[PDB]
Amino acid sequence: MMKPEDVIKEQCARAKVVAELWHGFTGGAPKAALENLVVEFNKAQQGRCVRPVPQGGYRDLSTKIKAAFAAGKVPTMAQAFEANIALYLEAKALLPIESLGVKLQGVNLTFLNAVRFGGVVYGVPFNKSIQVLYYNKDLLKKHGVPVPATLEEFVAAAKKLSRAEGGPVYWFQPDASTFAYFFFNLGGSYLKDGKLVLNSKEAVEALTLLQNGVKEGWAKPITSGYINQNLGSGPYAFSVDTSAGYTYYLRAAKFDLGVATLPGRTKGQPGYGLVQGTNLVVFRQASKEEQAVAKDFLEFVLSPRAQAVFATATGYVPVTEGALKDPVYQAYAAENPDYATIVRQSRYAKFEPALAEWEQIRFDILGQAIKEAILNKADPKAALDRAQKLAEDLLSS
Numbered sequence: 601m602m603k604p605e606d607v608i609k610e611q612c613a614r615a616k617v618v619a620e621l622w623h624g625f626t627g628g629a630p631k632a633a634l635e636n637l638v639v640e641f642n643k644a645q646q647g648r649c650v651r652p653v654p655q656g657g658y659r660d661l662s663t664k665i666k667a668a669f670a671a672g673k674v675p676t677m678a679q680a681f682e683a684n685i686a687l688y689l690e691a692k693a694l695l696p697i698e699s700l701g702v703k704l705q706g707v708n709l710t711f712l713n714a715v716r717f718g719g720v721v722y723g724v725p726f727n728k729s730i731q732v733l734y735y736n737k738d739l740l741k742k743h744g745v746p747v748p749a750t751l752e753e754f755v756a757a758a759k760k761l762s763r764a765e766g767g768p769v770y771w772f773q774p775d776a777s778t779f780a781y782f783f784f785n786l787g788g789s790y791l792k793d794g795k796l797v798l799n800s801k802e803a804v805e806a807l808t809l810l811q812n813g814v815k816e817g818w819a820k821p822i823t824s825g826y827i828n829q830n831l832g833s834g835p836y837a838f839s840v841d842t843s844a845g846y847t848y849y850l851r852a853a854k855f856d857l858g859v860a861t862l863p864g865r866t867k868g869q870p871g872y873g874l875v876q877g878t879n880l881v882v883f884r885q886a887s888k889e890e891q892a893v894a895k896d897f898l899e900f901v902l903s904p905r906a907q908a909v910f911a912t913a914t915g916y917v918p919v920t921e922g923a924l925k926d927p928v929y930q931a932y933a934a935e936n937p938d939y940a941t942i943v944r945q946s947r948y949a950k951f952e953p954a955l956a957e958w959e960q961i962r963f964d965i966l967g968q969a970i971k972e973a974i975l976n977k978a979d980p981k982a983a984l985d986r987a988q989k990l991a992e993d994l995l996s997s
């Protein structure tokens with residue numbers, strides 16, 4: 601009857617034209633904030649609505665988009681990572697955004713650069729996250745431990761707090777996103793002379809750091825659920841996690857949650873965070889009329905108020921300069937120093953490779969190498985040499 605998705609269903613039933621938007625939000629603040637945006641957009645249109653359709657998580661979404669093509673029936677819009685855009689571009693499946701008439705002046709260059717392919721923009725940055733350092737303010741105060749500003753300090757702090765609390769206080773998922781933080785901040789790069797390399801010396805160093813942290817009793821692998829679904833079980837000091845975790849950490853944490861910029865190589869600058877979350881793309885297969893709904897919706901999404909409300913509700917990074925000048929954004933940042941912390945971290949941002957095969961590689965090849973080393977004590981170099989060979993085989997295929 602009156603939940604936001606019930607209201608959207610009633611709005612789309614009355615509408616002349618309905619543009620489907622397929623997404624990967626399972627719940628929480630992200631799902632609610634997307635639905636609230638859509639309700640507001642749909643109220644403003646005479647008979648021209650967006651229908652958000654949850655597809656599960658992001659990988660369920662791309663699988664379903666792939667099947668939708670094979671079935672010949674794609675949605676008007678979807679969320680897509682840069683790797684998903686690369687893949688959909690092989691099938692010529694995406695409309696250039698600037699062709700549609702969406703104005704992109706004032707979108708963060710970081711974000712716009714990531715959705716530009718052969719000099720053409722194919723996505724609108726929508727829900728873009730950055731990794732931040734979550735921490736337990738209470739536990740650091742209890743032992744006199746400053747928030748670590750360098751990787752050296754962070755390791756030292758994890759050791760000191762783990763010894764004091766009798767268990768590993770740095771919590772991590774053994775996955776490609778957590779690996780990227782350590783890899784990037786040890787000077788790693790995935791592309792060497794245009795070739796994807798998973799077994800570089802910095803990759804080996806990064807994976808060895810995490811495996812040694814598990815051995816030394818300062819790093820705790822989280823194998824079942826998000827870190828924020830594991831809090832309460834054992835002492836927690838720190839995690840490196842997406843800024844879109846923010847609402848889930850806040851609800852779960854039974855301690856005073858802190859958010860900091862990432863530890864870097866030196867105090868000269870924060871460490872680089874991995875940019876995650878998604879862009880909205882518009883499919884060529886849409887009708888001209890559905891495409892016109894997409895154009896109005898994308899201009900609404902990029903309006904400063906819509907950005908301000910969406911970002912402060914979720915911990916995503918506002919994608920426009922105008923969002924930071926909007927009073928609703930300003931009011932929230934003044935009350936909550938974590939929004940500002942998330943925006944400052946967004947200045948020190950790195951992306952994974954924008955390759956069609958990258959989604960498969962990050963989970964099934966690279967993520968599996970990281971799990972072998974962390975959970976089964978595989979030799980880090982042996983595990984990443986295996987990854988490198990599977991990735992080369994997949995790309996050459």
Ligand SMILES: Nc1nc2c(ncn2[C@@H]2O[C@H](COP(=O)(O)O[C@H]3[C@@H](O)[C@H](n4ccc(=O)[nH]c4=O)O[C@@H]3CO)[C@H]3CC(O)(O)C[C@H]32)c(=O)[nH]1
Pocket residue numbers: 624625626628630658659662681682683684727729730775777826828829842843844845846848876877878958959962
């Ligand atoms: N398919 C595919 N996924 C990719 C790719 N690159 C990265 N990722 C995944 O992006 C997630 C980050 O995206 P983000 O929007 O920042 O965060 C998500 C959720 O992670 C996070 N969440 C949800 C529930 C919860 O209890 N806690 C919480 O933090 O909230 C958001 C909305 O669901 C990572 C997580 C991952 O899914 O394990 C693997 C990573 C790619 O190329 N393809």
Ligand SMILES: [Cl-]
Pocket residue numbers: 743764
């Ligand atoms: Cl003590």
Ligand SMILES: [Cl-]
Pocket residue numbers: 788789790791951952
């Ligand atoms: Cl790189």
